[PDB]
Design an enzyme around this catalytic site. Structure first.
Site, PDB file in Angstrom:
ATOM      1  N   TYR A 164       0.750  -1.284   0.056  1.00 38.76           N
ATOM      2  CA  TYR A 164       0.102  -0.178   0.001  1.00 38.76           C
ATOM      3  C   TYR A 164       0.789   1.168  -0.113  1.00 38.76           C
ATOM      4  CZ  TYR A 164      -3.546   3.646   1.676  1.00 38.76           C
ATOM      5  OH  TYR A 164      -4.161   4.881   1.603  1.00 38.76           O
TER       6      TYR A 164
ATOM      7  N   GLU B 260      -3.250   7.579  -3.739  1.00 34.09           N
ATOM      8  CA  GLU B 260      -3.461   6.251  -3.189  1.00 34.09           C
ATOM      9  C   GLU B 260      -3.169   5.321  -4.325  1.00 34.09           C
ATOM     10  OE1 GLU B 260      -7.140   4.680  -1.772  1.00 34.09           O
ATOM     11  OE2 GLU B 260      -6.373   4.800   0.473  1.00 34.09           O
TER      12      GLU B 260
END
Ligand SMILES: CC(C)(COP(=O)(O)OP(=O)(O)OC[C@H]1O[C@@H](n2cnc3c(N)ncnc32)[C@H](O)[C@@H]1OP(=O)(O)O)[C@@H](O)C(=O)NCCC(=O)NCCS
Lengths: 310, 393
Positions: free
Chosen positions: B116, B204
């Site tokens: 991530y 993101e």
């Protein structure tokens, strides 16, 4: 650190004010009201109009001149979003003690840059942007709040909301308690003054016997203020704190008007703010219409306690 | 505003960030040729709509699944013919669906590992922060709740910019090794400068990963743009697909009105964001179900009030209206006349509660009751809420 400049929030009858964006629509208008209210507005800035006369007062090209020529100790910004962050910087550089930025729409990245330089000094205290300013009822008013609903008194109000502050003001005027100092910190996510900043002043000020904290969704400043109260407003001679936290029906993922009012990734919801506030001793008014009666009743509860035990 | 997948990944590709190769087909034939042109061992085909869960969606043509896999470009053509023009319903769209005009025809890359990585303007930290986890492919929130020791954060000083040491360190902490460390550190940099260029509040990347052949690739990403900075992201905001928002919200937008649709039947409009949220709460709080949040902004006009009333009176869910305005330094009699004017011209036929406050509230509460329209006034915000909730049952 920058926290040293917190005292400059307590605007008073010797505060002398200049207006950045003075000749503009909103600079002009709210300057007229500052003069109607009796606030020591003394001049203003507009690039390229230094020399002009406006509302019987001098217009300057730069904050530096305005400060030198008038002895101004506070600045209010009505400069449009593309340039407002530059105006804030000019006033930090000019070392103005108190700077109120009414402007909505300043890019967040701008305000990160502004905050970077802001946090690295201590002469200038910034309130805002995207706020209605600060008012010491009857003594000094910097911003767009209507003077006539206020009344000098005992409740400190700090708030992320403009129109909600008016409710609190009107209610605390209606119940007879009056306001000692109101500070609207505005609805942007990057700004120069949080709740903690106002509480330290409220807690240390004798005119302020009660506090109202008005908050809303987004960020963590309510939660930080809850911790702060646990360290500084416990023990005896603590001051009652009533709060209202807006946006309990707000859907996630959405900006609810204020750029700073949004729940994202599960962080920033209203109910987390209520629990955290209530765990520090804060009385949350369920209803926004009851800030006044709730802070009022809080004072009654202390009086009933004294009558009981004598 | 929201970018389509192809718009957002092209934005990233043009700024040095590595993404799956892809083309954008307007026609089933376009999808076929694109599939051929890819030099791809496997092709993926993805409906271009803004809603989520496109994976398990349905098409009026009968096709199940907005996203499909195949090694055969011919398959792409057929499946595209069953998408383009037709409508895709998901667990994020009204039962109507959404019209699918474009499909993405991309190469499908195998994932060997998943991390991530997002760049974010963090309110707590006062600046940009890198947030990474070696544990990718799951929602970041669950990771923090279960394994906070696997959340790593680097604050970036906004003037100094991202330094190589910061990129090396995050890459290392996400478990890239050797030449993948260099790619990851490089890509973290390019992602960060992408995030400053486009005035993002968040970029993101999940999954931020590795292919088997040894390539770091942002397999998927979501960009959040600062609405404030529109005046200097003209070209990006122009890409906005306004055609998937609630059309009320779009019309409200046309008049500097900040509207957001809720699932209720009591409409309300208020000047002030925070007071608008409070009015929503205090309505519900007295039993009701508010239809919307609406913020007139600071200034109240005889004309802006009209457009607000025009919206709410045009919404089929709306069975009542609570107006709550702080007149401030304007005579509230000059607001109630703007209200009676707009309510007569719009032929108000739902019961309207109006709370006013400011100068001359006395003569203002009179014009509202003397209007000969279904209008009743209220003394405060509890009254209006209580009265408005009563008006439906
Ligand atoms: C800041 C804001 C009020 C400006 O609106 P406005 O007063 O209608 O704007 P104007 O077009 O009159 O511009 C104001 C002036 O700023 C001046 N100005 C521009 N850059 C400047 C600078 N760096 N320093 C000083 N003045 C500057 C302009 O020249 C203009 O004066 P002029 O027209 O005589 O040249 C507006 O952008 C805004 O923020 N709206 C309200 C938001 C709000 O309600 N926030 C409160 C939250 S509670």
């Amino acid at each position: 650190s920058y926290t040293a400049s917190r005292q400059h929030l307590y605007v008073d009858k010797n505060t002398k004010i200049i207006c950045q964006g003075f000749t503009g629509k909103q600079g002009t208008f709210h300057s007229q009201q500052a003069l109607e209210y009796g606030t020591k507005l003394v001049g203003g800035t507009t690039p390229g109009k230094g020399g002009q006369t406006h509302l019987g007062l001098p217009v300057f090209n730069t904050v530096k001149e305005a400060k030198e020529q008038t002895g101004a100790t506070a600045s209010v910004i009505y400069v449009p979003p593309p340039f407002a962050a530059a105006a804030i910087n000019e006033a930090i550089e000019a070392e103005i003690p108190l700077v109120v930025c009414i402007t909505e729409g300043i890019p967040q990245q701008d305000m990160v840059r502004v905050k970077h330089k802001l946090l690295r000094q201590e002469k200038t205290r910034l309130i805002g942007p995207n706020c209605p300013g600060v008012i010491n009822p009857g003594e000094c008013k910097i911003g767009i709040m209507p003077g006539h609903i206020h009344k000098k008194g005992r409740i400190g109000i700090v708030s992320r909301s403009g129109t909600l502050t008016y409710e609190a003001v009107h209610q605390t005027t209606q119940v007879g308690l009056g306001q000692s100092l109101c500070v609207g910190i505005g609805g942007d996510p990057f700004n120069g003054t949080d709740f903690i900043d106002c509480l330290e002043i409220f807690l240390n000020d004798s005119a302020t016997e009660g506090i109202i904290l008005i908050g809303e969704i987004g960020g963590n400043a309510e939660e930080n203020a809850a911790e702060f109260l646990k360290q500084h407003n416990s023990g005896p001679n603590s001051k009652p704190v009533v709060s209202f936290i807006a946006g309990l029906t707000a859907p996630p993922g959405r900006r609810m008007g204020h750029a700073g009012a949004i729940i994202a990734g599960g962080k920033g919801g209203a109910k987390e703010k209520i629990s955290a506030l209530q765990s520090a001793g804060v009385v949350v008014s369920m209803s926004p219409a009851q800030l006044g009666t709730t802070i009022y009743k809080e004072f009654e509860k202390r009086k009933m306690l004294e009558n009981l035990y004598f | 505003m929201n970018l389509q997948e192809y718009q957002s990944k092209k934005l990233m590709s043009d700024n040095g960030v590595r993404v799956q190769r892809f083309f954008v087909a307007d026609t089933a034939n376009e999808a076929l040729e694109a599939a051929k042109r890819l030099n791809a061992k496997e092709i993926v085909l993805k409906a271009q709509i803004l809603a989520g869960g496109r994976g398990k969606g349905v098409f009026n043509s009968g096709l199940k699944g907005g996203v499909h896999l195949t090694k055969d470009p011919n398959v792409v053509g057929q499946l595209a013919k069953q998408m383009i023009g037709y409508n895709l319903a998901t667990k994020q769209t009204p039962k109507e669906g959404v019209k699918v005009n474009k499909v993405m025809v991309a190469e499908a890359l195998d994932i060997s590992r998943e991390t991530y990585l997002a760049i974010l303007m963090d309110r707590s930290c006062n600046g940009p922060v890198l947030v990474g986890s070696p544990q990718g492919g799951v929602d970041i929130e669950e990771v923090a709740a279960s394994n906070p020791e696997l959340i790593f954060k680097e604050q970036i000083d906004i003037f100094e910019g991202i330094k190589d040491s910061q990129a090396q360190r995050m890459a290392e902490n996400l478990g890239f090794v050797g030449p993948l460390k260099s790619q990851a550190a490089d890509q973290i940099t390019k992602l960060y400068n992408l995030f400053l260029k486009i005035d993002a509040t968040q970029v993101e990347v999940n999954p931020f990963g590795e292919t088997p052949e040894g390539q770091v690739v942002c397999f998927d990403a979501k960009i959040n743009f600062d609405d404030n900075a529109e005046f200097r992201q003209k070209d990006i905001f122009a890409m906005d697909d306004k055609s998937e928002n609630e059309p009320i919200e779009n019309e409200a937008a046309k008049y500097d009105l900040k509207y957001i649709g809720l699932d209720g039947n009591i409409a309300c409009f208020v000047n002030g964001a925070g007071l608008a949220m409070a009015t929503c709460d205090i309505i519900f709080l007295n039993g009701g179900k508010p239809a919307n949040f609406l913020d007139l902004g600071g200034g109240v006009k005889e004309a802006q009030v009209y457009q607000a009333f025009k919206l709410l009176t045009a919404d089929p869910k709306v069975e009542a209206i609570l107006v709550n305005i702080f007149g401030g330094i304007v005579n509230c009699a000059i607001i109630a006349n703007g209200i009676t004017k707009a309510c007569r011209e719009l032929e108000l036929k739902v019961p309207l509660v109006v709370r006013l406050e400011g100068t001359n509230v006395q003569e203002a509460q009179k014009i509202l009751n003397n209007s000969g329209l279904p209008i009743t006034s209220a003394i405060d915000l509890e009254d209006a809420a209580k009265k408005a909730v009563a008006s439906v049952a």
